[PDB]
């Protein structure tokens, strides 16, 4: 079996991408944020505190299949400070035709203020390694851990687009979606993340510097968070650039042609086009823009978010000994 779905930016800043999922019998279609930096399938539901609800809600009582994982509960916190918890049901879930039975669907009783204000995101689909699932007392396999045994190939692919639709493939590798070949690189699961190590970086037409950079592929993260020295090296080529404490990071004139960024993958090189990095005006009408690359020093973990991921065709190979593929497009 295989599944294919379209993935859409929730705005003109690619702040995030939503992907329709069909939960329960009959189908209840929800827009979910596929988040590889985590491992939980949770959704706004009839159980969610009303006043916290502004989103398409999941009603398990309208599902014939939906069961109640008795005595089970989940709570989770994210980098941005957001959070949510509630209880768990087992129900049928289908993503781009791919149908999985008995997939644990976490029902939100409560959701932090951030989500509630997020109208376009009905919930998230965790695609990290199961060990990071928050359900208690027994953890629940992700959508991907559950589909593996029925997939043609234990791989899923994220082909995110720059200010345009992209795609999530499950079980197969579309050789038409990318160019050249795919270079695979080790993945450490010690943290339960898709954690690999980049062989280095370059700024524009400058020299590639071999320097180890341990980070994670997190589609559920908007920007590119790298060590400080690296980041600064980049903006140092950008004249109007400067670090802004009030805005919270590196800004630069919206009229500056930004240099491309290159991160090594094995002996391979993925080039992030300058344009991608020019994230967007700090506010509508401003002539000051916000950079897509920022220091990871605050998060305490290097993260290749959508600014990097969307510049390549990525392969999350869920075989016994996982690997992360990377190819240009």
């Amino acid at each position: 079996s295989t599944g294919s779905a379209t993935t859409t930016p929730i705005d003109s800043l690619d702040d995030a991408y939503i992907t329709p999922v069909q939960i329960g019998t009959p189908a209840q279609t929800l827009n979910l944020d596929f988040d590889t930096g985590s491992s939980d399938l949770w959704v706004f539901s009839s159980e969610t505190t009303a006043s916290e609800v502004x989103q398409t809600i999941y009603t398990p009582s309208k599902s014939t299949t939906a069961k109640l994982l008795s005595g089970a509960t989940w709570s989770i916190s994210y980098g941005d400070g957001s959070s949510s918890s509630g209880d768990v049901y087992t129900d049928t879930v289908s993503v781009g035709g791919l149908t999985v039975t008995g997939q644990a669907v976490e029902s939100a009783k409560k959701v932090s203020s951030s989500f509630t204000e997020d109208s376009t995101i009905d919930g998230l689909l965790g695609l990290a390694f199961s060990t990071l699932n928050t359900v208690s007392p027994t953890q629940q396999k992700t959508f991907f851990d559950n589909a593996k045994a029925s997939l043609d190939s234990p791989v899923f692919t994220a082909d995110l687009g720059y200010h345009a639709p992209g795609t999530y493939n499950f079980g197969f590798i579309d050789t038409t979606a990318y160019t050249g070949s795919i270079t695979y690189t080790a993945v450490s699961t010690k943290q339960g993340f898709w954690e690999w190590t980049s062989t280095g970086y370059a700024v524009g037409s400058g020299t590639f510097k071999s320097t180890s950079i341990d980070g994670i592929a997190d589609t559920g993260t908007t920007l590119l968070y790298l060590p400080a020295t690296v980041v600064s090296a980049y903006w140092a080529q950008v004249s109007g650039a400067k670090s802004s404490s009030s805005v919270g990071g590196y800004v630069f004139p919206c009229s500056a042609t930004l240099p491309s960024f290159t991160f090594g993958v094995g002996s391979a090189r993925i080039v992030i086009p300058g344009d991608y990095i020019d994230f967007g005006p700090i506010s509508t009408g401003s002539s000051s823009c916000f950079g897509g690359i920022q220091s990871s020093a605050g998060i305490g973990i290097n993260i290749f978010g959508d600014v990097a991921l969307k510049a390549a065709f990525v392969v999350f190979n869920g075989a016994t000994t996982p690997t992360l593929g990377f190819a240009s497009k």
Partner: peptide, 7 residues
């Protein structure tokens, strides 16, 4: 309007 997903 950056997004930042477990801790």
């Amino acid at each position: 309007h950056p997004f930042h997903x477990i801790h």
